């Protein structure tokens, strides 16, 4: 049987208006016998036809893979608008329906703390700058790292962990060359969450 995947849009996309948030509907393991896939898109019940559908790509048990992407609107998704994808195939007993929407519950602003390089780290060849985030709802968040108005891509961020009370937390960790840190450069911790004024806050870090 063919499985369906309905991905929510990148939290950075839903929070940056210069970007376009999109819900993706992936269909995997689609057979040679019945390879046609018909996508239906719904918003709270109301069907929409604006969606774009890419051609097929090959798979392994000599099968196919189909993808349909639907532009959603920033203000729309953030309200908690329910998005539905109806996938139909001749090899399907019935039409398959997946549903994804921004999580309900009282939204909360994240707190951001910065942890400068450790005493050990400072002896090593590269240092790790750390950014700790806690008390946020929903888990939709986008932590990124920048230095001198340019991106720093050499970082890793844990998935949002559920807090005991009901909020979320995570840790992001940028690894930089020590000489760059020692040279006095400032490194910023960009956090984009729904419950942030202008969806943006920034704590930075310098020697």
């Amino acid at each position: 049987g063919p499985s369906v995947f309905l991905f929510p849009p990148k939290p950075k996309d839903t929070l940056m208006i210069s970007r376009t948030p999109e819900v993706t509907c992936v269909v995997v393991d689609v057979s040679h016998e019945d390879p046609e896939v018909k996508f239906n898109w719904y918003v709270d019940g109301v069907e929409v036809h604006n969606a774009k559908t890419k051609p097929r790509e090959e798979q392994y048990n000599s099968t196919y893979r189909v993808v349909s992407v639907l532009t959603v609107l920033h203000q729309d998704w953030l309200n908690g608008k329910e998005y539905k994808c109806k996938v139909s195939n001749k090899a399907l007993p019935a039409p398959i329906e997946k549903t994804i929407s921004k999580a309900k519950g009282q939204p909360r602003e994240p707190q951001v703390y910065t942890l400068p390089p450790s005493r050990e780290d400072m002896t090593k060849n590269q240092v790790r700058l750390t950014c700790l985030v806690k008390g946020f709802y929903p888990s939709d968040i986008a932590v990124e790292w920048e230095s001198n108005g340019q991106p720093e891509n050499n970082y890793k961020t844990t998935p949002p962990v559920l807090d005991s009370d009901g909020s979320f937390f995570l840790a992001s960790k940028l690894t930089v060359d020590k000489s760059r840190w020692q040279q006095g450069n400032v490194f910023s911790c960009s956090v984009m969450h729904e419950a942030l004024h202008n969806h943006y806050t920034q704590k930075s870090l310098s020697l």
């Binding site: 929070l15 940056m16 208006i17 210069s18 970007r19 990124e144 920048e146 108005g149 340019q150 991106p151 960009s190 984009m192 004024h197 202008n198 969806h199 943006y200």
Partner: peptide
């Protein structure tokens, strides 16, 4: 007021 991110606009209140 508008917050930006590395050149691209984030959000305006």
């Amino acid at each position: 007021d508008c917050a930006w991110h590395l050149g691209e606009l984030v959000w305006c209140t």
